[PDB]
Amino acid sequence: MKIIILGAGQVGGTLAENLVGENNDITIVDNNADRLRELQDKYDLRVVNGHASHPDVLHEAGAQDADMLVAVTNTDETNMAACQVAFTLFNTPNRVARIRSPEYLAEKEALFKSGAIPVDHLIAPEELVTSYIERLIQYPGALQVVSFAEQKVSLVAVKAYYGGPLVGNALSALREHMPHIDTRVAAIFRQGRPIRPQGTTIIEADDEVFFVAASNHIRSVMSELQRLEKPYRRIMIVGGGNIGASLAKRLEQTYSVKLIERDYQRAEKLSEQLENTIVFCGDAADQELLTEENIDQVDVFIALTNEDETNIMSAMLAKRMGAKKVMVLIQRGAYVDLVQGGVIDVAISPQQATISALLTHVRRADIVNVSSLRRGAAEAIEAVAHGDETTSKVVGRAIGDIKLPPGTTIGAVVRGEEVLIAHDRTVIEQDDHVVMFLVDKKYVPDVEALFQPSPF
Amino acid sequence: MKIIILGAGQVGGTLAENLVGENNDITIVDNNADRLRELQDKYDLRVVNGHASHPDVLHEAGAQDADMLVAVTNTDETNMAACQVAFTLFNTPNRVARIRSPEYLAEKEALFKSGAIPVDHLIAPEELVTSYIERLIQYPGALQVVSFAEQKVSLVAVKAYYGGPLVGNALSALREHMPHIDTRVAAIFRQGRPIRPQGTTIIEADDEVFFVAASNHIRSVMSELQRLEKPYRRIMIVGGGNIGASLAKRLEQTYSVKLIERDYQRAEKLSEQLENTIVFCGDAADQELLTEENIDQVDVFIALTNEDETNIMSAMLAKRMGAKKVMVLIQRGAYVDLVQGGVIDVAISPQQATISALLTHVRRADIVNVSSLRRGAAEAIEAVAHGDETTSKVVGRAIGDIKLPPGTTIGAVVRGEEVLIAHDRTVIEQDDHVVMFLVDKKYVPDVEALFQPSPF
Amino acid sequence: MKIIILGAGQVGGTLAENLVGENNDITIVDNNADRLRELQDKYDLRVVNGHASHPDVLHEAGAQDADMLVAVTNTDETNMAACQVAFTLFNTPNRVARIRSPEYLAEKEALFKSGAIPVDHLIAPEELVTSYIERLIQYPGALQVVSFAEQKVSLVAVKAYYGGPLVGNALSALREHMPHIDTRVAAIFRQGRPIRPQGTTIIEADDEVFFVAASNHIRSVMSELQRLEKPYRRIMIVGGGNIGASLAKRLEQTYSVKLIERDYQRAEKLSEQLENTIVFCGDAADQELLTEENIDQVDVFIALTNEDETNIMSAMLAKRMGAKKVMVLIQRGAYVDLVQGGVIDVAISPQQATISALLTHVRRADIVNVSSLRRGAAEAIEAVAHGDETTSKVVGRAIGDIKLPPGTTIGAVVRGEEVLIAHDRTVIEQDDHVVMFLVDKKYVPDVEALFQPS
Amino acid sequence: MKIIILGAGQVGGTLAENLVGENNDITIVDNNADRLRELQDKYDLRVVNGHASHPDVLHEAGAQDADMLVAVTNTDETNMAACQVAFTLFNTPNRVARIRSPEYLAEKEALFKSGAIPVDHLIAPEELVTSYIERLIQYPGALQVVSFAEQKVSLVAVKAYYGGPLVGNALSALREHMPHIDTRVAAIFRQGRPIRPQGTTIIEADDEVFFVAASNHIRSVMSELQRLEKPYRRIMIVGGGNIGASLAKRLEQTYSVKLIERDYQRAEKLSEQLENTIVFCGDAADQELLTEENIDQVDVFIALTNEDETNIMSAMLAKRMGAKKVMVLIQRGAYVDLVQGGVIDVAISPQQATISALLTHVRRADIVNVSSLRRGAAEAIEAVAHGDETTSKVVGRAIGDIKLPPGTTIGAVVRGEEVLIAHDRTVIEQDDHVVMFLVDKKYVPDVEALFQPS
Ligand SMILES: Nc1ncnc2c1ncn2[C@@H]1O[C@H](COP(=O)(O)OP(=O)(O)OP(O)(O)=S)[C@@H](O)[C@H]1O
Ligand SMILES: Nc1ncnc2c1ncn2[C@@H]1O[C@H](COP(=O)(O)OP(=O)(O)OP(O)(O)=S)[C@@H](O)[C@H]1O
Ligand SMILES: Nc1ncnc2c1ncn2[C@@H]1O[C@H](COP(=O)(O)OP(=O)(O)OP(O)(O)=S)[C@@H](O)[C@H]1O
Ligand SMILES: Nc1ncnc2c1ncn2[C@@H]1O[C@H](COP(=O)(O)OP(=O)(O)OP(O)(O)=S)[C@@H](O)[C@H]1O
Ligand SMILES: Nc1ncnc2c1ncn2[C@@H]1O[C@H](COP(=O)(O)OP(=O)(O)OP(O)(O)=S)[C@@H](O)[C@H]1O
Ligand SMILES: Nc1ncnc2c1ncn2[C@@H]1O[C@H](COP(=O)(O)OP(=O)(O)OP(O)(O)=S)[C@@H](O)[C@H]1O
Ligand SMILES: Nc1ncnc2c1ncn2[C@@H]1O[C@H](COP(=O)(O)OP(=O)(O)OP(O)(O)=S)[C@@H](O)[C@H]1O
Ligand SMILES: [Mg+2]
Ligand SMILES: [Mg+2]
Ligand SMILES: [Mg+2]
Ligand SMILES: [Mg+2]
Numbered sequence A, B: 001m002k003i004i005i006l007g008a009g010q011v012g013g014t015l016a017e018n019l020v021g022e023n024n025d026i027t028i029v030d031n032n033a034d035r036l037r038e039l040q041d042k043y044d045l046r047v048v049n050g051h052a053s054h055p056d057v058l059h060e061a062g063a064q065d066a067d068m069l070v071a072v073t074n075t076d077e078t079n080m081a082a083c084q085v086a087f088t089l090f091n092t093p094n095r096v097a098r099i100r101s102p103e104y105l106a107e108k109e110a111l112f113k114s115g116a117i118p119v120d121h122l123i124a125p126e127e128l129v130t131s132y133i134e135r136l137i138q139y140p141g142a143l144q145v146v147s148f149a150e151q152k153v154s155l156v157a158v159k160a161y162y163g164g165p166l167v168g169n170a171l172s173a174l175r176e177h178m179p180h181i182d183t184r185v186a187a188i189f190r191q192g193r194p195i196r197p198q199g200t201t202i203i204e205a206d207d208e209v210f211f212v213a214a215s216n217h218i219r220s221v222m223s224e225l226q227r228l229e230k231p232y233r234r235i236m237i238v239g240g241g242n243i244g245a246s247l248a249k250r251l252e253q254t255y256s257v258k259l260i261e262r263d264y265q266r267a268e269k270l271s272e273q274l275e276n277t278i279v280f281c282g283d284a285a286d287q288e289l290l291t292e293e294n295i296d297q298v299d300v301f302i303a304l305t306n307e308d309e310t311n312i313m314s315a316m317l318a319k320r321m322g323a324k325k326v327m328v329l330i331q332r333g334a335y336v337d338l339v340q341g342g343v344i345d346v347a348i349s350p351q352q353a354t355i356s357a358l359l360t361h362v363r364r365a366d367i368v369n370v371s372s373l374r375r376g377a378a379e380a381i382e383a384v385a386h387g388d389e390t391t392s393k394v395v396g397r398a399i400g401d402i403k404l405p406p407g408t409t410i411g412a413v414v415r416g417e418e419v420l421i422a423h424d425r426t427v428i429e430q431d432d433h434v435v436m437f438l439v440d441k442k443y444v445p446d447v448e449a450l451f452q453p454s455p456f
Numbered sequence C, D: 001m002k003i004i005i006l007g008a009g010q011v012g013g014t015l016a017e018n019l020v021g022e023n024n025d026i027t028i029v030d031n032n033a034d035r036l037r038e039l040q041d042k043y044d045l046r047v048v049n050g051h052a053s054h055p056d057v058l059h060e061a062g063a064q065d066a067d068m069l070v071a072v073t074n075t076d077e078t079n080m081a082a083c084q085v086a087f088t089l090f091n092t093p094n095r096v097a098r099i100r101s102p103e104y105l106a107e108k109e110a111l112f113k114s115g116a117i118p119v120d121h122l123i124a125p126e127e128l129v130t131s132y133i134e135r136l137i138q139y140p141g142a143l144q145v146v147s148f149a150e151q152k153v154s155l156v157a158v159k160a161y162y163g164g165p166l167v168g169n170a171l172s173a174l175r176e177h178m179p180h181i182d183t184r185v186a187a188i189f190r191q192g193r194p195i196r197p198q199g200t201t202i203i204e205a206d207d208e209v210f211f212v213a214a215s216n217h218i219r220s221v222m223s224e225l226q227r228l229e230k231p232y233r234r235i236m237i238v239g240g241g242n243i244g245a246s247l248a249k250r251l252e253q254t255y256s257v258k259l260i261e262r263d264y265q266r267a268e269k270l271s272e273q274l275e276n277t278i279v280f281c282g283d284a285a286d287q288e289l290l291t292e293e294n295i296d297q298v299d300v301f302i303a304l305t306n307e308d309e310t311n312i313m314s315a316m317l318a319k320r321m322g323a324k325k326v327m328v329l330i331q332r333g334a335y336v337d338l339v340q341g342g343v344i345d346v347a348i349s350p351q352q353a354t355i356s357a358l359l360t361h362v363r364r365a366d367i368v369n370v371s372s373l374r375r376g377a378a379e380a381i382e383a384v385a386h387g388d389e390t391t392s393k394v395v396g397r398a399i400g401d402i403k404l405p406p407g408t409t410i411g412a413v414v415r416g417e418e419v420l421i422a423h424d425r426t427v428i429e430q431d432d433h434v435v436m437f438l439v440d441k442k443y444v445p446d447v448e449a450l451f452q453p454s
Helices: A010-019 A033-042 A055-060 A076-090 A125-138 A218-223 A242-251 A264-273 A287-292 A308-320 A333-339 A350-362 A441-451 B010-019 B033-042 B055-060 B076-090 B125-138 B218-223 B242-251 B264-273 B287-292 B308-320 B333-339 B350-362 B441-451 C010-019 C033-042 C055-060 C076-090 C125-138 C171-175 C215-223 C242-252 C264-273 C287-292 C308-320 C333-339 C350-364 C441-451 D010-019 D033-042 D055-060 D076-090 D125-138 D171-175 D215-223 D242-252 D264-273 D287-292 D308-320 D333-339 D350-364 D441-451
Strands: A002-006 A025-030 A046-049 A068-071 A095-098 A121-123 A144-147 A153-159 A185-190 A193-195 A208-214 A234-238 A256-260 A277-280 A300-303 A325-329 A346-348 A368-375 A378-384 A408-415 A418-421 A433-438 B002-006 B025-030 B046-049 B068-071 B095-098 B121-123 B144-147 B153-159 B185-190 B193-195 B208-214 B234-238 B256-260 B277-280 B300-303 B325-329 B346-348 B368-375 B378-384 B408-415 B418-421 B433-438 C002-006 C025-030 C046-049 C068-071 C095-098 C121-123 C144-148 C153-159 C184-190 C193-195 C208-214 C234-238 C256-261 C277-281 C300-303 C325-329 C346-348 C369-372 C379-384 C408-415 C418-421 C433-438 D002-006 D025-030 D046-049 D068-071 D095-098 D121-123 D144-148 D153-159 D184-190 D193-195 D208-214 D234-238 D256-261 D277-281 D300-303 D325-329 D346-348 D369-372 D379-384 D408-415 D418-421 D433-438
Touching (some): A002 A010, A002 A076, A010 A025, A010 A033, A010 A350, A025 A033, A033 A046, A055 A076, A068 A350, A076 C076, A095 A350, A125 A242, A125 A346, A125 A350, A144 A368, A153 A218, A185 A378, A185 A408, A208 A218, A234 A308, A264 A277, A287 A308, A308 A325, A308 B333, A333 A346, A333 A350, A333 B308, A346 A350, A378 A441, A433 A441, B002 B076, B010 B025, B025 B033, B033 B046, B055 B076, B076 B095, B121 B350, B125 B144, B125 B242, B125 B325, B125 B346, B125 B350, B144 B368, B153 B218, B208 B418, B234 B242, B234 B308, B242 B256, B242 B264, B264 B277, B333 B346, B333 B350, B346 B350, B350 B368, C002 C010, C010 C025, C010 C033, C010 C350, C010 C369, C025 C033, C055 C076, C076 C095, C121 C350, C125 C144, C125 C325, C125 C346, C125 C350, C144 C350, C144 C379, C153 C215, C171 C184, C184 C408, C234 C308, C242 C256, C242 C264, C256 C264, C264 C277, C300 C308, C308 C325, C308 D193, C308 D333, C333 C346, C333 C350, C333 D308, C333 D333, C346 C350, C379 C441, C433 C441, D002 D010, D010 D025, D010 D033, D010 D369, D033 D046, D055 D076, D076 D095, D095 D350, D121 D350, D125 D242, D125 D325, D125 D346, D125 D350, D144 D350, D144 D379, D153 D215, D153 D408, D234 D242, D234 D308, D242 D256, D242 D264, D256 D264, D264 D277, D287 D308, D333 D346, D333 D350, D346 D350, D350 D369, D433 D441
Parallel strands (some): A002 A068, A234 A256, A234 A300, A256 A277, A300 A325, A325 A346, B002 B025, B025 B046, B068 B095, B095 B121, B234 B256, B234 B300, B256 B277, B325 B346, C002 C025, C025 C046, C256 C277, C300 C325, D002 D025, D002 D068, D068 D095, D095 D121, D256 D277
Antiparallel strands (some): A185 A193, A185 A208, A378 A433, A408 A418, A408 A433, B144 B153, B153 B208, B185 B193, B185 B208, B368 B378, B378 B433, B408 B433, C144 C153, C153 C208, C184 C193, C184 C208, C369 C379, C379 C433, C408 C433, D153 D208, D184 D208, D369 D379, D379 D433
């Protein structure tokens, strides 16, 4: 697998970090020499200093031979130009590009899906975020929904609280309750540190507990944990930009939505374009605006401006003034787990989201796929069981008898269209998709080795 | 009292906001028309659009007749030029100027105190902050030390916690304990909202409780509340700029200080200039640097970079990694109370500090002086009891019999050199300094009226 | 004619300014509200605020109906995306784009000429500039060569001097002293004011005289006016960049070229890429370097750095130190007419060159285009004679019987591939290309009326 | 001589460049590491990185021991603080400061001349520029007036023309045809190269000839060279700013002045402040406005906006439209020598003017200062003859017996308040001020050796 990453920013670099290994040859292009040196010190990859869409720069990165091209530069127009130039001159297969402009996506069918602009897969960070928040809204009480390249399976995170079904009970004590639907804990995060879920792991308060669920039965699982809270009525959105306006349009038909936008010329525009949203012109930190429009009633306050501090301060104010749940948009995913949990209920990063999507396309045709759950060294992953018992170290063997790396816990198996909750006696069959959670991502290539069969 | 404020930034504007009234005529100079319109809408003051140090602009603000000149522009050199031009051309008395440069203050004696540069009072925001943090370090457990223009009296804030002397006990129940030293609660802040301290006010957890103390006996009061924790051993400072390097120099002789500075060229300089400080070159968010230098041992982690988010994220990480107490430098005082309390122990603003100092010079020769305790509408103040019983509405009368405005509580009286803890039977004598806390600062001019005697 | 210009910078703005008029609907798209306003204040055109390559912005500027799209934004990648989006979504005809990157141009065949990236016409200023200089070197004595028609016609500017062939002679007296060559004076600039060339106009010293010539007979005209100087032998180029390195390749095999380049790692690279050029490592203003390499022998000194300040100081030093002629590259177009002529013989601007080229695409699409000449010597336009005698006020008539506005001079008529030097007896036939020069831009729209049929 | 220059911009940099040499220890302070490096790369001087007014930065540049402090930073308030801090902390002598604000200058008496703000010498470029133009208007025909000594000596530049008094005459032939007036040609610039003025130098057309004259007898010299033109009657100023409004006040009472100002609220203000000036509201490039107000009658058109582009286009239009002479204000100093002379008669730069003034303070402190003339016509310096015959190689000798370097011409000798036009028999006495002109800057340090005693 020969991979070229155009632009070594947060997204390109983090991607590069997640793809270094045996079966992957990573080359990164960037015109900033400082960024290249920094990345090369940490990881085994090749670097090209130049403009990502220049024919020679692209040639020097070996676009004729490469198997995938990922364009994550500063600009859509450079990403588009890179994919055009690469395709036209070198026939480079699998061209993925980040496109941040909703204007382009509005014509994505006519522009990209016709091969006019030769992009195979658009990664639209603004769209992904809007979809994620909306999906959280759909499951009141849900702290995080984890996705895999296998769309049939998901994880749902919830926060344990005093006098809740979860707090105090060990994991094995929950397994005594089998009514209607049964799930298994995939991961724990207390105090920002990952705990490997064992039978005798006592759930403490303020833990972030991730349960395994079929993607089409999340509501049903949360219900059966007495953790599905009543539907959100009142949503308040701060920041009427690309993301804010998008989310409001998606919600206004089913929810009661208020939006605050401090630019009057932009705000007036949003009032007509949003038929069922009440749009206010005002500042996010304005106590008297938040009070006048009853912030004490708001079920979820969502801060979606582009400045993290504005969002943070705003949401912290909303919580102080009685908003039930608050969500903030944090730019860099590193800060997400940090700022989350205490006072701020949920933090979402457009960079994380982009990276999550990008890992579902690259890890495709690989053994292991990384999930959208990545916190520090911790991360949930999916691996494929190729081969039969004769050639594989996992196929045929039972889950309780698999030589997993340290810190690694198998949470569920996806066989065809059925999602099986992991048990010790369960036998891994061929071409299964095994979902694991690792406390430390350094053992991924070990998981890779484990699931890699002998040469047929 | 005729006051000219040069520069209507955060400091100038906030000052202007605090000084509007009957006995004060406020004029603000600024070259940004937008900033002027905004301020005039809210407050009764005069605005001049021009350069603060131009002879005509200064003339147009009435510098010949004015009684005080406050220079808080963007630049020290403009502040200095304004004070020179005002003095030389109009003999304007009482010239206060903000000087941010330690280089100038290093020669403050030869430059200002000689009348070469005609500044009467330097307001040095970097120095004030360094002094404040240091003063907090001196009283382990102290959340905030409140100062007044009467240097003889102070307030000390502490946070109530479960199984602590404070939590659960009503205020009257504390008055049953009179050993050695006795104090009175001046203010309460729970959930960021001010509560007027009454006899039957039950102290809840995480409340910010302010006790009255003589400025020279703070340690003695905290001791007698079982709230003076053991001396801080290990201090870790992030950001080796003006403030960070300053604080380290002050502490290194009495504390074990580590400093982190990400710029290697600046960091190397600090290693030699700080004889007893260990200086590290590295990033604030670097988990492995913080761990290698045992952040789990750090008694107080102090984030003093100029970026609030950097400081916030950094300190939140330090707390997660086990640092006992964390303090952050937040630029705008509005965010200070917001970000404080939850996870971040203390937030300090250089703007607040400047404003605090500026209010001790202006309110001088006034009736009321505002303290360094200002949180939203809430603020602690000091008023002077001028006149005798014949002409005053407060002198002679007992504290329990004073027609105070709503939300107002007298906490202590400073008579000469003795600080008297307020009791209901205490009689106000002449020229006393009465310390009150108001839940809403809108009643200040009422306090002013109350302490204003009849025309002699 | 509905024309869309993307980006209202120097080039986009000047262009619109050159085409705003009667038969032209100019819409300018730009990301900057302020540049649009200035343009609307000055001219009656439509302005659209948005990103030049966004589908809605292109549609809102009416790309569906438009007849030409000109992309002159900040970056090639936006120009390309814009041409792409316009073609794919709206089938916008005649898509012209500025492409500054030699890297993209190196693959011009594979990228653009195949319709992968749908640019119909590339305007590459660096190349045009390089080409212009080379064209000047080819005609020693030429201060300026301007093109009209499809470049089929040219003007050759020369400066008249004391004890010279031009000075002293009336214009009609020159038509009688030229035996087998046909030319016409198109414009003159003496003192600080432009003069309309008449029969009784005596050429005074230091005048810049513009002659009309067929492009394939420029050398023959200059020769027989005793104004074609002997071939340049020694050329010195300062600055080995895109333009410098390029111009050197074009010259080194037929001329003796030395190049000065202060970037030492760059100088080494060029030393290899230039088979017949001597590359010196040094600063352009270094006298001890310039005197060492015989600047007094240098026929043409060419300063091609990106710094106008360097170019000017460099050339003036060279001129001071005895170089015969000096040519500079000027970025800021305002100064070009000034900088040329006195101490510095020739000044060349990449923005001007772009505007020229964009107007050669105007000249092929049969729109009349105004252009100002050097130092306001005259404003030049080329117009088409539409209609027959019945519907046109010009077709059929001889030049001597046409009521042209004051200050207006017809210089030549272009019939197909045939260039007729304008004479009083010359009859304009239908669809002819009449190239004229005006002393005043205030009479510009009047000429349009002549050539616009009923 | 230990000299500190605060701020290494155009002015600070040029200054250092003019004074770096043998007897001068130049230290430049600047906030920008890059500007310092370029300066150190080019010249051997000391560079200090810090804020020009910080006590340690001033001390580290050796303000205690320094002999002159020049403040040419970005803002007056920093220049002032620097002069303040230097005086208060280190007693730094001769503190020169650039002050651009007319507001500060309006209170020059009360603020600076009293030692409240310890600036010894104010350099106010806007005023100097205004003063220069006014001085040009006073001597019609003067293209340039440059000053030497304590302004006691001047050069008057004029352009020679066909059928003119200068052209055709050898220089020695002019000394014999001037009856009761004494002058000397100091420099000439013909073609693109400077010529050393000798007896047998015949003046050709379009040469710029510089004459030496006592400052109090400039008019008498120009008159008796048949080169003093008749007084200007009609003046037109574009741009009513600090310089424009100021120049108008100085001219309106003795000349007929019209002013064009596109800022309408500004035009109204000036209409009141200018008792004898007609203020028109309009753009400078508006032909219908320029033709309405008889631009063909205008003796001098002066474009004083902050936009070079406006000034150039404005003036060239005026020159095109028949105005006798046009003068412009040019911000970017690189273009000045070029822009002047051809279509635009006079170009004036505020940065150059500042450098001149800063060098008049150099001329009072008895340091020899180099300055380049217009278009490199010659480099001019004024030097002092220190010592007696025993210790000096120049004192006592007559000019005709002094071995000057090649290209070097002594133009005048200044003894006290007495200006002696240089002659071969003229003997240099002690502490004389000898003003010389060099064609080449490479012979500059050689001249110092002559005047430096043992
Ligand atoms: N035209 C270009 N050619 C090559 N590399 C580029 C180009 N533009 C940007 N880059 C590099 O690509 C990386 C990403 O660019 P940024 O300016 O960080 O854009 P961004 O929108 O912040 O995206 P990220 O990845 O979330 S920081 C940067 O590190 C740049 O150095
Ligand atoms: N304090 C505030 N209160 C209310 N609205 C705010 C506040 N701060 C920012 N906004 C709005 O929220 C968004 C923050 O984004 P900005 O960084 O200002 O712009 P931007 O995000 O670059 O533009 P977009 O939306 O991505 S096309 C803007 O639309 C602001 O109008
Ligand atoms: N030279 C000047 N003359 C007059 N007013 C000025 C000048 N410079 C700045 N101001 C105004 O003074 C105010 C404070 O300036 P800022 O640029 O905000 O400086 P600051 O260091 O941020 O100080 P603050 O008050 O904490 S925001 C601004 O609102 C400016 O509009
Ligand atoms: N992530 C980080 N880790 C460690 N040190 C940091 C980090 N970010 C900033 N710093 C340092 O902390 C300070 C932050 O201030 P900046 O805004 O970069 O500079 P500055 O404060 O304007 O300069 P000063 O100190 O006020 S003269 C700087 O000295 C940085 O070197
Ligand atoms: N004083 C000088 N003497 C000699 N060469 C110089 C001098 N100043 C600049 N140059 C050279 O002129 C060249 C012009 O290169 P640049 O214009 O900077 O880059 P480029 O590759 O030509 O791309 P463009 O077209 O300018 S965006 C540079 O390589 C410089 O080294
Ligand atoms: N506060 C400062 N302290 C020290 N040096 C400074 C300061 N501000 C500017 N300088 C330097 O002073 C020089 C003058 O810079 P500018 O004032 O920006 O140029 P300018 O206003 O065009 O005036 P000049 O000198 O004609 S370029 C610059 O090179 C700066 O690097
Ligand atoms: N095309 C034009 N026609 C007439 N007047 C103009 C034109 N362009 C600019 N101006 C005027 O020229 C004047 C010059 O003013 P400015 O230079 O902008 O300000 P100023 O008060 O002179 O301060 P300085 O010295 O430039 S920092 C302006 O008031 C403009 O209105
Ligand atoms: Mg295509
Ligand atoms: Mg004829
Ligand atoms: Mg003083
Ligand atoms: Mg003689």
